[PDB]
Design a binder for this molecule. Structure first.
Ligand SMILES: O=P(O)(O)OC[C@H]1O[C@H](OP(=O)(O)OP(=O)(O)O)[C@H](O)[C@@H]1O
Ligand SMILES: [Mg+2]
Ligand SMILES: [Mg+2]
Ligand SMILES: [Mg+2]
Ligand SMILES: [Mg+2]
Lengths: 345, 347
């Protein structure tokens, strides 16, 4: 009933897939039953034909059903993710924002890869900071228990994605597959701060999150950043109670001086490492501001699990707690505790 | 300057390529420097972004410039081709191939380009091969076939060996792309006229565009029933290409007295079955198959007339129908096929 020619032909006719087809196509790829030419066609055609939440949801689902889980009852019910799609065109604001959030006591489980794969970045910079990025399910859990944060290395948790990843490296261009990182976190946290460079596709990511009933803020800086920016306003899709809701967000309302795009910027892994140490050590400046802002974001999303949570006080509490996790040195200390953890195994 | 991410990114942005990019891409493909994923992505991306005449011409041109030519001065200025894209999803009898033989028998030089089937049960080359005709001849001997029989057959895999890299890849995706247009645009003998079949109603105008740029006299045809031939079951759309301009027409056989046929009457089988249908028609069997053969054959004869400006549409069709029918009725077509087989076995 399903088949590659059927599905590819339907995509090249500019038609949404029937429900199930996207899933079948991803399952073919996962099971190794997909020629690298079919993977490539699907990936491009799914992109040029504007992909829908259901379709993206089916891809992420199938991927997740082949992924290694974390052991039962080790992921707190209120964990969050802090991550972006990448393809921005930075300093690793997410990485820092994630450390600050965990430091404030919100459990964080992150998903990522090394740069230029379809499943997000940040592992390089984490590796340059001394953190062990590729641990199995059991140790990611133990890290989340002992440290307050764990990192799920995509190759480790999605070994069947191998093929799709190789193919996508060669076409060397953004596709619908670049949305899968935030959506295929093996630990399935119910909250998060999710950045997206591709503005059209943010609302699609948001809808996938709505269907999971997650409490998530998908964020797009109106300067094109895959984070909440301080260059200008941002667009936020507030995902709550299964509903999506598009908003405009201006950090001026909380006293954030406008910064230039090129101050939140210019980062290879060894440099990004140094920016983290600078900033976690108290270096004031536009990078700190944007880390503080995005961390508050994740903490607001965490508050949104409560369902009695109000938007503006949630942001103040968020800004307050992230500021304090930095200024107390709890964040710097958490990073250190994270590195030590990785050495004591 | 140019790269796969540059070119693939532009296409995915739903943007027309810059001049030279399509050519660079096709040239990477032809020389073996393109990865399978790059090829598939390009072909699919180029299809979903409506491709332009310039783009398809650059693909076709790179291909031609890598193909094996026929020798100097062996192709008449007025040679015609009779060939389609294939991929109509109907396994009809081989209309183009039967048309080609009739046309050569009317005294119009035919240099046909061809291939085995990709989806149907028997392609032109398959059916020709089943008849005793040699499909695998090289350039020199294709030239000699044309001189001695009046017809030559250029087997695409033989003249376009560097297409091998794109062939396997495109087969694997199993869906038609812009690449499915190249066969009829890459006849290595570069004849200036033809009747060119297109299975895809939405890409047929682009093919006409490519032919218009070369200043060929060509009718690009699509049956409104989906045939990559002139049909007899209904009307056909014709992009007439002449003096560098394209001109869209609708064509109705009823006007030249043709009864409406049913698609299943034009249906065919494997290479042996399709070879028996050619023998039946060239033998004088009246009926719908013959009807469609005569019709297309006139079609090509009209494209041939169109090499000369001041040829008029109606009298050229009428003259075309007389000559196609006569070619069959006098035994001339049936004899040329025999001479053609004889020629193969005598080298
Ligand atoms: O496999 P398909 O996609 O169905 O295509 C069937 C055939 O039609 C095309 O050529 P040609 O113009 O010689 O067609 P003919 O069979 O009508 O002679 C193509 O080269 C195939 O041989
Ligand atoms: Mg990020
Ligand atoms: Mg970023
Ligand atoms: Mg044909
Ligand atoms: Mg046909």
């Amino acid at each position: 009933v399903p088949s590659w020619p059927q599905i590819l032909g339907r995509l090249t006719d500019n038609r949404d897939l029937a429900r199930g087809q996207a899933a079948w196509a991803m399952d073919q790829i996962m099971t190794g039953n997909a020629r690298p030419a079919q993977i490539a066609a699907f990936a491009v055609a799914m992109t040029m034909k504007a992909p829908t939440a259901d379709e993206v949801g089916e891809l992420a689902g199938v991927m997740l059903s082949h992924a290694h889980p974390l052991p039962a009852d080790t992921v707190p019910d209120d964990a969050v993710d802090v991550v972006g799609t990448g393809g921005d065109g930075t300093v690793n604001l997410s990485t820092m924002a994630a450390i600050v959030v965990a430091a404030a006591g919100v459990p964080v489980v992150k998903h990522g890869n090394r740069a230029a794969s379809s499943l997000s970045g940040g592992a390089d910079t984490l590796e340059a900071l001394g953190v062990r990025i590729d641990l199995g399910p059991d140790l990611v859990a133990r890290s989340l228990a002992e440290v307050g944060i764990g990192f799920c290395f995509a190759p480790r948790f999605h070994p069947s994605y191998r093929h799709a990843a190789a193919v996508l490296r060669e076409i060397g261009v953004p596709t619908v597959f670049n949305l899968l990182g935030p959506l295929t976190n093996p630990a399935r946290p119910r909250a998060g701060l999710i950045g997206c460079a591709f503005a059209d596709l943010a609302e699609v990511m948001a809808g996938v999150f709505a269907a999971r009933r997650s409490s998530v803020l998908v964020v797009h800086g109106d300067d094109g950043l895959d984070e909440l920016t301080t260059t200008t306003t941002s667009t936020i899709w507030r995902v709550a109670a299964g509903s999506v809701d598009k908003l405009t967000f201006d950090p001026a309302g909380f006293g954030f001086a406008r910064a230039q795009l090129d101050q939140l910027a210019g980062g290879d892994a060894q440099a990004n490492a140094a920016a983290v140490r600078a900033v976690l050590g108290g270096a004031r400046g536009p990078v700190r501001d944007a880390v503080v802002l995005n961390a508050a974001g994740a903490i607001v999303a965490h508050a949104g699990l409560s369902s009695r949570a109000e938007w503006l006080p949630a942001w103040e509490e968020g800004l307050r707690r992230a500021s304090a996790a930095i200024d107390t040195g709890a964040a710097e200390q958490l990073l250190a505790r994270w590195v030590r953890f990785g050495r004591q195994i």
